[PDB]
Design an enzyme around this catalytic site. Sequence first.
Site, short mmCIF file in Angstrom:
data_model
loop_
_atom_site.label_atom_id
_atom_site.label_comp_id
_atom_site.label_asym_id
_atom_site.label_seq_id
_atom_site.Cartn_x
_atom_site.Cartn_y
_atom_site.Cartn_z
N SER A 1 -3.32 3.89 -1.39
CA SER A 1 -4.34 4.79 -0.87
C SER A 1 -4.56 5.87 -1.93
O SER A 1 -3.67 6.69 -2.18
CB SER A 1 -3.91 5.41 0.46
N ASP A 2 -5.73 5.86 -2.56
CA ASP A 2 -6.03 6.84 -3.61
C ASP A 2 -5.96 8.26 -3.05
O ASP A 2 -5.52 9.18 -3.74
CB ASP A 2 -7.42 6.61 -4.23
N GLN B 1 -22.78 -1.54 4.21
CA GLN B 1 -22.22 -2.54 3.30
C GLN B 1 -21.91 -3.88 3.94
O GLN B 1 -21.39 -4.79 3.28
CB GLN B 1 -20.95 -1.98 2.66
N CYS C 1 -20.60 20.27 4.88
CA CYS C 1 -19.32 20.97 4.72
C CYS C 1 -19.45 22.28 3.93
O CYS C 1 -19.97 22.28 2.82
CB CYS C 1 -18.31 20.06 4.02
N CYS D 1 -26.03 6.83 -1.66
CA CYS D 1 -25.09 7.95 -1.58
C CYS D 1 -24.72 8.44 -2.97
O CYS D 1 -24.89 7.72 -3.97
CB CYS D 1 -23.83 7.56 -0.82
N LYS E 1 -22.58 -7.62 5.53
CA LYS E 1 -23.46 -8.70 5.10
C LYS E 1 -24.17 -9.43 6.24
O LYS E 1 -25.10 -10.19 6.00
CB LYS E 1 -22.67 -9.72 4.27
N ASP F 1 -9.72 2.66 -6.61
CA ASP F 1 -10.37 2.13 -5.40
C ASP F 1 -9.97 0.70 -5.00
O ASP F 1 -9.76 0.43 -3.81
CB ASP F 1 -11.90 2.22 -5.53
N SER G 1 -6.30 17.05 2.56
CA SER G 1 -6.94 16.09 3.44
C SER G 1 -7.71 16.82 4.54
O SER G 1 -7.11 17.41 5.44
CB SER G 1 -5.91 15.15 4.06
N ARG H 1 0.80 -1.22 0.00
CA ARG H 1 0.00 0.00 0.00
C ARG H 1 0.84 1.26 0.00
O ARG H 1 0.37 2.31 -0.45
CB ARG H 1 -0.94 0.04 1.21
#
Length: 384
Positions: free
Chosen positions: A138-139, A219, A246, A96, A221, A133, A151, A56
């Site tokens: 980390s995008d 998300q 925001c 969303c 299950k 994604d 950020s 990563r």
Amino acid sequence: NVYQLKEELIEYAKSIGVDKIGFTTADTFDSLKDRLILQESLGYLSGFEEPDIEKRVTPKLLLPKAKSIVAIALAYPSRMKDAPRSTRTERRGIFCRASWGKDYHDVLREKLDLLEDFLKSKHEDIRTKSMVDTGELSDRAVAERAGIGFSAKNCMITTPEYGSYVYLAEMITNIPFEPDVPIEDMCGSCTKCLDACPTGALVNPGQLNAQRCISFLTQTKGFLPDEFRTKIGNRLYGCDTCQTVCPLNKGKDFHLHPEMEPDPEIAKPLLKPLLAISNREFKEKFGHVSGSWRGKKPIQRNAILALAHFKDASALPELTELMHKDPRPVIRGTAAWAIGKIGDPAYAEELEKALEKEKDEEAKLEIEKGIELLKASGMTKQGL
Ligand code: B12
Ligand code: SF4
Ligand code: SF4
Ligand SMILES: [Cl-]
């Protein structure tokens, strides 16, 4: 030469609909490494991250002899045109904004493929590795280092022109492009996102406890923990609250990519038809949005919870059928709980009867919970 190629790449990217493009080196993400280990230590990650931390944070592991990363962003719409009203007889749930229109995974990969072919067409032994994604990087870390956005306290990469309403992607290359400069933090002393988060999942500025984040929770299950069943509202997939409150997103509603336009009938769908949707119909209607990637079960579980939230008594017969007939314990159990939560005592006896026929211990537990909810509300009405 490399400067010329960079300028040409930027111009080309813009022409095919890339809204913002930036450049960073392929150096290791040392800061990110420490952060990932800490978040892991705290139990704050989601499990949707690439598990191998070295991969990563090390672009040169992903693409041997890498020299740069090209970062891209596309703005997505934040307002739904002709949004249908959710009413007492016709309650709706909501997806969303990142699940409006065609799956961003497909759109941004299509753009990366074009940028890759642009580079390869030069016939100069250029090598690339692209991701959106579902890759190791980390995008956001890439986007920050490439000057796409800063950020923010809600953890979003936030751009000055488009706000936080952007999809991110990146392409590692062996081209020594001059990197860009990170941009200024614009949050100041604001804490609106942290204050508005329904679960307090934003535990510190720029720090998410993903296990408490509604976006993550929609998300999952399995059964949703009880504490979140009254906080999910009518959300079927994802959560936009820390973005919509925001100030930096005020007046940011961009409609620059036709395929991203939401179809209101699936983006803000009627809840009751979701309770009985076939696999074929789900695939046909929802199969091309990002919010379908975990299949229909979490969406149907959430639809049940939303009906309980609205205390929709007209859904009680269908929930009762689901409680008895659905092959999935999570659906049977959540339906039983919802029957209890909706609060019509006429269904208490059928819950009692269902309890004695249900063989799955977790579903049994949910029926017990539903019976208890009805008992409690019954007592409250009688001042007991
Ligand atoms: C796992 C995942 C999630 C998890 C966890 C999110 C999180 N905040 O970590 C869940 C399921 C909750 C989630 C939710 C959402 N996500 Co998500 N998700 C991802 C995924 C796959 C990895 C994220 C990750 O690795 N997080 C780990 C944290 C620790 O790191 P990071 O956020 O990636 O990087 C930042 C931190 O490390 C921070 N940091 C580094 N050092 C330090 C030091 C200090 C002191 C501090 C405070 C911070 C800090 O700076 C980095 C750069 O910003 C990415 C795609 C990808 N491969 O990167 C998409 C991604 C982050 N998700 C995205 C979206 C759109 C969302 C949602 C808005 C969807 C929705 N509407 O519900 C929400 C937003 C929730 C939120 N407020 O963050 C976009 C965000 C784009 C943007 N403009 O920021 C991404 C980039 C996908 C994409 N390619 O478009 N997601
Ligand atoms: S997505 Fe929703 S639950 Fe998650 S941090 Fe933002 S406001 Fe909180
Ligand atoms: S709501 Fe305020 S603190 Fe949160 S991201 Fe937006 S500007 Fe920053
Ligand atoms: Cl070159």
